Design a protein around this motif. Structure first.
Motif, mmCIF file in Angstrom:
data_model
loop_
_atom_site.group_PDB
_atom_site.id
_atom_site.type_symbol
_atom_site.label_atom_id
_atom_site.label_comp_id
_atom_site.label_asym_id
_atom_site.label_seq_id
_atom_site.Cartn_x
_atom_site.Cartn_y
_atom_site.Cartn_z
ATOM 1 N N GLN A 1 0.828 -1.236 0.000
ATOM 2 C CA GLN A 1 0.000 0.000 0.000
ATOM 3 C C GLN A 1 0.857 1.279 0.000
ATOM 4 O O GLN A 1 1.125 1.838 -1.064
ATOM 5 N N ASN A 2 1.268 1.747 1.178
ATOM 6 C CA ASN A 2 2.103 2.936 1.257
ATOM 7 C C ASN A 2 3.327 2.667 0.384
ATOM 8 O O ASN A 2 3.953 1.611 0.504
ATOM 9 N N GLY A 3 3.624 3.593 -0.527
ATOM 10 C CA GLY A 3 4.753 3.434 -1.427
ATOM 11 C C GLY A 3 6.072 4.071 -1.014
ATOM 12 O O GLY A 3 7.063 3.952 -1.729
ATOM 13 N N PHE A 92 -3.744 8.487 0.350
ATOM 14 C CA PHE A 92 -3.444 9.101 1.618
ATOM 15 C C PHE A 92 -1.969 9.006 1.999
ATOM 16 O O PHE A 92 -1.463 9.890 2.684
ATOM 17 N N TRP A 93 -1.247 7.991 1.528
ATOM 18 C CA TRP A 93 0.160 7.917 1.898
ATOM 19 C C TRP A 93 0.983 9.065 1.318
ATOM 20 O O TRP A 93 2.055 9.380 1.838
ATOM 21 N N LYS A 94 0.469 9.695 0.262
ATOM 22 C CA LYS A 94 1.140 10.835 -0.349
ATOM 23 C C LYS A 94 0.705 12.085 0.370
ATOM 24 O O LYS A 94 1.525 12.903 0.761
ATOM 25 N N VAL A 95 -0.592 12.200 0.594
ATOM 26 C CA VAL A 95 -1.164 13.361 1.267
ATOM 27 C C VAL A 95 -0.504 13.681 2.601
ATOM 28 O O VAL A 95 -0.338 14.856 2.954
ATOM 29 N N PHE A 140 -13.431 4.042 6.905
ATOM 30 C CA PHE A 140 -14.415 2.987 7.032
ATOM 31 C C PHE A 140 -14.241 1.959 5.926
ATOM 32 O O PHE A 140 -14.526 0.781 6.130
ATOM 33 N N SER A 141 -13.742 2.398 4.768
ATOM 34 C CA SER A 141 -13.542 1.498 3.635
ATOM 35 C C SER A 141 -12.139 0.962 3.492
ATOM 36 O O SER A 141 -11.869 0.208 2.560
ATOM 37 N N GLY A 142 -11.228 1.363 4.370
ATOM 38 C CA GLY A 142 -9.859 0.889 4.238
ATOM 39 C C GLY A 142 -8.917 1.923 3.640
ATOM 40 O O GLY A 142 -7.708 1.692 3.635
ATOM 41 N N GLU A 143 -9.456 3.006 3.066
ATOM 42 C CA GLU A 143 -8.636 4.102 2.510
ATOM 43 C C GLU A 143 -8.055 4.761 3.737
ATOM 44 O O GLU A 143 -8.712 5.581 4.373
ATOM 45 N N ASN A 144 -6.832 4.383 4.067
ATOM 46 C CA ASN A 144 -6.179 4.867 5.267
ATOM 47 C C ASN A 144 -4.700 5.021 4.966
ATOM 48 O O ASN A 144 -4.112 4.155 4.325
ATOM 49 N N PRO A 145 -4.075 6.129 5.399
ATOM 50 C CA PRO A 145 -2.646 6.305 5.122
ATOM 51 C C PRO A 145 -1.762 5.241 5.788
ATOM 52 O O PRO A 145 -0.623 5.030 5.359
#
Ligand SMILES: Nc1nc2c([C@@H]3N[C@H](CO)[C@@H](O)[C@H]3O)c[nH]c2c(=O)[nH]1
Ligand SMILES: [Mg+2]
Length: 278
Positions: A1-3, A92-95, A140-145
């Motif tokens: 996920q996080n790159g 989100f990992w970029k944000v 809630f959907s998994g979109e998490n940093p």
């Protein structure tokens, strides 16, 4: 996920530490129409996001896209004059990338700000709302940093979020407001984040309020989750830039233009509050 690798954050913190003598202890992220909070910094050194390796770029109007170090009311701070959002195409990992860099820089407290539409009927355009808590809809959907392998060097696998917004700082922020000499008091409440970029429908607005939200935006929440993950003390506030339309008759329509205008009309009040707050 996080790159991003641990070393990526390091590389960037290394870059900043060798290009400025400034050693910020506090970080402020300035939301839409809130870039003026940069204005009072002394010994200011600016870097455009474009020149900092690994940094995303601000593409929303009202976001300068500059990182400014300096001194504000005696405190050494670094300000994000403009931020990043999910609706711009950023995971989100970029944000939240800057947030971990701040921790690496030696920052201990993060103050987040944003422009939010008011859901609580008692809020007025211009009101400043202390963020007491949040509802992370994307989460809630998994979109998490934090999604993906965990970096123990930043924090733990499952960090708690029920104590995310430092109570002490909200207590202080309130008395500091007393000293402000403002007519209208300092509001406080729950901020809900959703993706955007479109503004809410009437049904959505009613739905969000019934979830117990006082204000809604498309930012902030992921930054706070990352900040807490790495142990930063978090304080945040929303400037109520508009009241979301909650009825089918209102000729009213949310718009970014009015949002930036409200930000401008309040950046002064905000200027002193955040500084006195320092
Ligand atoms: N969801 C939402 N965002 C905003 C905003 C924030 N400012 C930008 C839009 O003007 C977005 O980044 C959003 O976070 C201001 N008013 C509203 C509103 O009524 N609803
Ligand atoms: Mg200098």
């Amino acid at each position: 996920q996080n790159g991003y690798t641990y070393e990526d954050y390091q590389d960037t913190a290394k870059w900043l530490l060798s290009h400025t003598e400034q050693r910020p202890q506090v970080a402020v992220i300035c939301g839409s129409g809130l870039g003026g909070l940069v204005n009072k910094l002394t010994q200011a050194q600016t870097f455009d996001y474009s020149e900092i390796p690994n940094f995303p770029e601000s593409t929303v109007p009202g976001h300068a896209g500059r990182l400014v170090f300096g001194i504000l009311n005696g405190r050494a701070c670094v300000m994000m004059q403009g931020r990043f959002h999910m609706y711009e195409g950023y995971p989100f990992w970029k944000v939240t990338f800057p947030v971990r860099v701040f921790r690496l820089l030696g920052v201990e407290t993060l103050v987040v700000t944003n422009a939010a539409g008011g859901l609580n009927p008692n809020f007025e355009v211009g009101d400043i709302m202390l963020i007491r808590d949040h509802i992370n809809l994307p989460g809630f959907s998994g979109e998490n940093p934090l999604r993906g392998p965990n970096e123990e060097r930043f924090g733990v696998r499952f960090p708690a979020m029920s104590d995310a917004y430092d109570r002490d700082m909200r207590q202080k922020a309130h008395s500091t407001w007393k000293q402000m000499g403002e007519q209208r008091e300092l509001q406080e409440g729950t901020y809900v984040m959703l993706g955007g970029p479109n503004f809410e429908t009437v049904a959505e607005c009613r739905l969000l309020r019934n979830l117990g939200a006082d204000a809604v935006g498309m930012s902030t929440v992921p930054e706070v989750i990352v900040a807490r993950h790495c142990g930063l003390r978090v304080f945040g506030f929303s400037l109520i830039t508009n009241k979301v339309i909650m009825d089918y008759e209102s000729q009213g329509k949310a718009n970014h233009e009015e949002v930036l205008e409200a930000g401008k009309q309040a950046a002064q009040k905000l200027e002193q509050f955040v500084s006195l707050l320092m």
